[PDB]
């Protein structure tokens, strides 16, 4: 029962994206607070804010779209699988990839915001190591996203013909999983930066 394992794994990946979104939003809330406190006193934070809203709106849409695809797949599977199940699994990998891409844009905006707050607030040693880690993961995440985009296109083409497909889907599950895990590391790095900025403000 490989197909049934795939659908349930997409459900886990979806839940991971949801929890990751929660934490990501929390970081936005942290950064806006520190930004408001250094502002008064004493912006192109206006365009940051615009860019935050654009991607927050997109990720919300993609999550809901993924929730709807997830229910469809779970239904199709309960009715006896796959023909339309297979296409819905490929589609769900498309949804998850786009949600990962939007979250990545959000992550790079928070990294920027943190660096702006750092330049104003500032010891020097752990921040240089933080910086190197942020650069490595951002760079790692890009090539992981690229690897997912390439596998998605290949999976989609093969779907339009017949079926190798099933192995491509499984490779794509792993591609997505690794992207999320690298993002969770990046997100822990941003949590640590906010926490540190908050700690320095009181000293």
């Amino acid at each position, epitope marked *: 029962q490989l197909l049934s394992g795939i659908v349930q794994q997409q459900n886990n990946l979806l839940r991971a994206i949801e*929890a990751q979104q929660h934490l990501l939003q*929390l970081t936005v*809330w942290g950064i*806006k*607070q520190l*930004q*408001a406190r250094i502002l008064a006193g004493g912006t192109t934070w206006m365009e940051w804010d615009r860019e935050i*809203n654009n991607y927050t709106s997109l990720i919300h849409s993609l999550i809901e779209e993924s929730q709807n695809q997830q229910e469809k797949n779970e239904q199709e599977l309960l009715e006896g699988s796959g023909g339309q199940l297979l296409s819905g699994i490929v589609q769900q990998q498309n949804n998850l990839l786009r949600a990962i891409e939007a979250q990545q844009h959000l992550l790079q905006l928070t990294v920027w915001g943190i660096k702006q707050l750092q330049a104003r607030i500032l010891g020097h040693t752990t921040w240089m190591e933080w910086d190197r880690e942020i650069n490595n993961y951002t760079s790692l995440i890009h090539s992981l996203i690229e690897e997912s985009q390439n596998q998605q296109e290949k999976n989609e083409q093969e779907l339009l013909e017949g079926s190798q497909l099933l192995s491509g889907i499984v490779q794509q599950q792993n591609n997505l999983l690794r992207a999320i895990e690298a993002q969770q590391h990046l997100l822990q790095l941003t*949590v640590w930066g906010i926490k540190q900025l*908050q700690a320095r403000i009181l000293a």
Partner: antibody
């Protein structure tokens, strides 16, 4: 998910502590605030927490009398108000911030409220 | 600082009526307004967040509008269970939080 401690009487000079239990267990993944409703009249934000960044915020009018605490081990949040006045008779609510909002102040999950009367 | 004024204080709509409520801010507050619904003896309930967004699971008859200082909350056609006091809430990241005075509903029947 939120559940609050029972209603209380307190003597004028006293301090009151109100508890708020979450079903989830971790405060390190949420923002929450305390809001009161003193008839008469209207809603007043007292303070808020983002425990993951060690952030605690207090409204200016309550600064110096209010403490907000979290306890991971009991998954219970506490607000304490000190130097109780006949002006502090109110219903107190703990509420969770919605993740949908661009700030941690769109309170979508609420406790049942705790009525505090300052008498003697 | 900042000042929020809600209008009106009360309304007497009939079941099936459109009802509109207003909040004005003293200074520009972009989209930082939320609307709540409070039934008597109950806690408030988030209906609208960030000026114009339906909170999940909230019925489609509820909607909100506005940008700088002028904001509007609308129930497209009132249902009997919609009986409640309605509040706007300004938020700032500093943080500053300010609730409006509220609009009470008296259903005509």
């Amino acid at each position: 998910q939120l559940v609050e401690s029972g209603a209380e009487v307190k003597k004028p000079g006293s301090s009151v502590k109100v508890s708020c239990k979450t079903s989830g267990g971790t405060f390190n993944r949420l923002a929450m605030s305390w809001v009161r409703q003193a008839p008469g009249q209207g809603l007043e934000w007292m303070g808020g927490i983002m425990p993951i960044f060690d952030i605690t915020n207090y409204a200016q009018k309550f600064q110096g009398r209010v403490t907000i605490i979290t306890d991971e081990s009991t998954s219970t949040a506490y607000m304490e108000l000190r130097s109780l006045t006949s002006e502090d008779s109110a219903v107190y609510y703990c509420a969770r911030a919605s993740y949908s909002s661009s700030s941690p102040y769109a309170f979508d999950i609420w406790g049942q409220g705790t009525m505090v009367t300052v008498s003697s | 600082d900042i000042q929020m004024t809600q209008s009106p204080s009360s309304l007497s709509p009939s079941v099936g009526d459109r009802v509109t409520i207003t909040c004005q801010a003293s200074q520009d507050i972009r989209n930082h307004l939320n609307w709540y619904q409070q039934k008597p003896g109950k806690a408030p309930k988030l209906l609208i967040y960030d000026a114009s967004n339906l909170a999940t699971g909230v019925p489609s008859r509820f909607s909100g509008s506005g940008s700088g200082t002028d904001f509007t909350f609308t129930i497209s056609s009132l249902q009997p269970e919609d009986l409640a006091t309605y509040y706007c809430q300004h938020y700032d990241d500093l943080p500053r939080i300010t609730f409006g005075q509220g609009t009470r509903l008296e259903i005509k029947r």
